[PDB]
Design an enzyme around this catalytic site. Structure first.
Site, PDB file in Angstrom:
ATOM      1  N   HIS A  57      15.735  -0.029 -18.438  1.00  0.00           N
ATOM      2  CA  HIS A  57      14.342   0.080 -18.868  1.00  0.00           C
ATOM      3  C   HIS A  57      13.541  -1.212 -18.703  1.00  0.00           C
ATOM      4  CE1 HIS A  57      14.148  -2.005 -22.805  1.00  0.00           C
ATOM      5  NE2 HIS A  57      15.377  -1.568 -23.020  1.00  0.00           N
ATOM      6  N   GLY A  59      12.219  -8.013 -27.009  1.00  0.00           N
ATOM      7  CA  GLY A  59      12.722  -8.840 -25.935  1.00  0.00           C
ATOM      8  C   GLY A  59      14.185  -9.201 -26.032  1.00  0.00           C
ATOM      9  N   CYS A  83      16.612  -6.922 -25.969  1.00  0.00           N
ATOM     10  CA  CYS A  83      17.378  -5.985 -25.158  1.00  0.00           C
ATOM     11  C   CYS A  83      18.076  -6.737 -24.049  1.00  0.00           C
ATOM     12  CB  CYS A  83      16.486  -4.901 -24.529  1.00  0.00           C
ATOM     13  SG  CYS A  83      15.516  -4.035 -25.671  1.00  0.00           S
TER      14      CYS A  83
END
Lengths: 306, 306
Positions: free
Chosen positions: A41, A143, A145
């Site tokens: 993603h 942020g 991830c």
């Protein structure tokens, strides 16, 4: 003496964290050899996240659209590939700080360390367990991830987790390093249900054994019990059932302490039905389930890692 | 979202841990530039520890009696010097992995990360606070002396603690990196009293603010209070008194959450006098005091470190 959650030393992982930037979306990536692993993603914007067609989205992207940065150097993406929910960004430079590593799919109830990162830079490290419902109760801001979970088997880093999503319930979801989610979650901004979480009984028992090793003995009771009787009580309190394999894992702890697993189970049962009750165990007022039997032995025996 | 104790990433410290061996005594040392820092009681045997004359003991030792090992390499001791309770072993090779570092003497209530080591090899990392009585409640087995506590100010490692002793009460005592003990402790195997430990009130308040940021709001009360009234209650429960400097430190948290420091104090006061009471805060059934206001801001804002 004493007992602390204790994360694995993070150094070997710190040299593998990179920043990946697609179209103004930036998260963390894992730079192992010539491949950067990151949540697919990254290619998504806030709107795309609501209903992404990843294949369609990825086809509109090219290697040149990926900006992998490591400190004050940038890697060049020569290739990109989607494995399940992971983007494999093939870069031009093999990571010189690549440790001996393995990818493992861990089981619910196992623990690992998380290296929380932002913009590819480490902020902190903490130890957590994979809940039985395949979520993790971590600390992840926007942020983070692409932050990774790991274990260290002496010289070998076992990467077991990559952070992908914060669920609307505030718990965290992610994948193994092959991009297969843990649990029934998908990388989409939609309401997703995690199962009922249960307490990890074998971990609680290992922690009780830790408490015995470190002087906390008040909970040892004057009663005993069987596996079938105990599991009947455990099911009532949302504790995972105990198997013979769990008994066998606890054998070393039983041998060190002279307390048979089934007797510890009777102590646990009492704590469950009648509470702790103003009292604490290893500084805790709640029963702790984020230590595996191996964590206890590791911390009580001083296992070092290369 | 979410909240975890969170240790600093340990990599920069891992490359500074070495093994020091004197006369069959072996503990950890800190290799910074050309100097290895370690507990002076390395020169002691089990019997010497009962009543050591360190000067007399050190004079019977020579540079060649010190075996500093780092992995599969050994440093050569060309010089040795005793600074308070630290041995400064001058070695022949400057540590190539020496980070930008500083030595700091921290204050009670500040937190830091500990890198627990054995035989100069890292086993784990955990975050803890310097108790008001200058002890630390760590996890230290035999041979972990010389493990170091540290903070990271972006690019700079601030070494603040070296582990020296487990007190017969099972708590841990140690020095700054200049070898001045924290607290009234000495490096001798004798009964030593730590003061009454108190809870670190400003840390509890910062943690309550963390709880508010992360959705736990049930403890916000409908009452208020003054500093003088609050400290009167805090003294009763063995909570350190709150100063205006503590209020000023919490200012940013008050501004983010819209909750004035004195109103949070009233919430705390209620929790103190009437308990939590089956309920939890940030997963905890006890009030947590090992987060400073800076830790909360750090973790709630995602501060990275080079």
């Amino acid at each position: 003496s004493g007992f602390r959650k204790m994360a694995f030393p993070s150094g070997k992982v710190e040299g593998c964290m990179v920043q990946v930037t697609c179209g103004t979306t930036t998260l963390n990536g894992l730079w192992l050899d010539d491949v950067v692993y990151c949540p697919r993603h990254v290619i998504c914007t806030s709107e795309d996240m609501l209903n992404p067609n990843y294949e369609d989205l990825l086809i509109r992207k090219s290697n040149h659209n990926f900006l992998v940065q490591a400190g004050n150097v940038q890697l060049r993406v020569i290739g990109h590939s989607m494995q399940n929910c992971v983007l494999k960004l093939k870069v031009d430079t093999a990571n010189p700080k690549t440790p001996k590593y393995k990818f493992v799919r861990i089981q619910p109830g196992q623990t690992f360390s998380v290296l929380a990162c932002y913009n590819g830079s480490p902020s902190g490290v903490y130890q957590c367990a994979m809940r039985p419902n395949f979520t993790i109760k971590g600390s992840f801001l926007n942020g983070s991830c692409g932050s990774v979970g790991f274990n260290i088997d002496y010289d070998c880093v076992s990467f077991c987790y990559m952070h992908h999503m914060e669920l609307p319930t505030g718990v965290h979801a992610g994948t193994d390093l092959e991009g297969n989610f843990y649990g029934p979650f998908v990388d989409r901004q939609t309401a997703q249900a995690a199962g009922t979480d249960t307490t990890i009984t074998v971990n609680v028992l290992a922690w009780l054994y830790a408490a015995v090793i470190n002087g906390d003995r008040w909970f040892l009771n004057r009663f005993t019990t069987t596996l079938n009787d105990f599991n009947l009580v455990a099911m009532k309190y949302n504790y995972e059932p105990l198997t013979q394999d769990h008994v066998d894992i606890l054998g070393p702890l039983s041998a060190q302490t002279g307390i048979a697993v089934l007797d510890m189970c009777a102590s646990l049962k009492e704590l469950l039905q009648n509470g702790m009750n103003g009292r604490t165990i290893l500084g805790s007022a709640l029963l702790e389930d984020e230590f595996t039997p191996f964590d206890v032995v590791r911390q009580c025996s001083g296992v070092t890692f290369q």
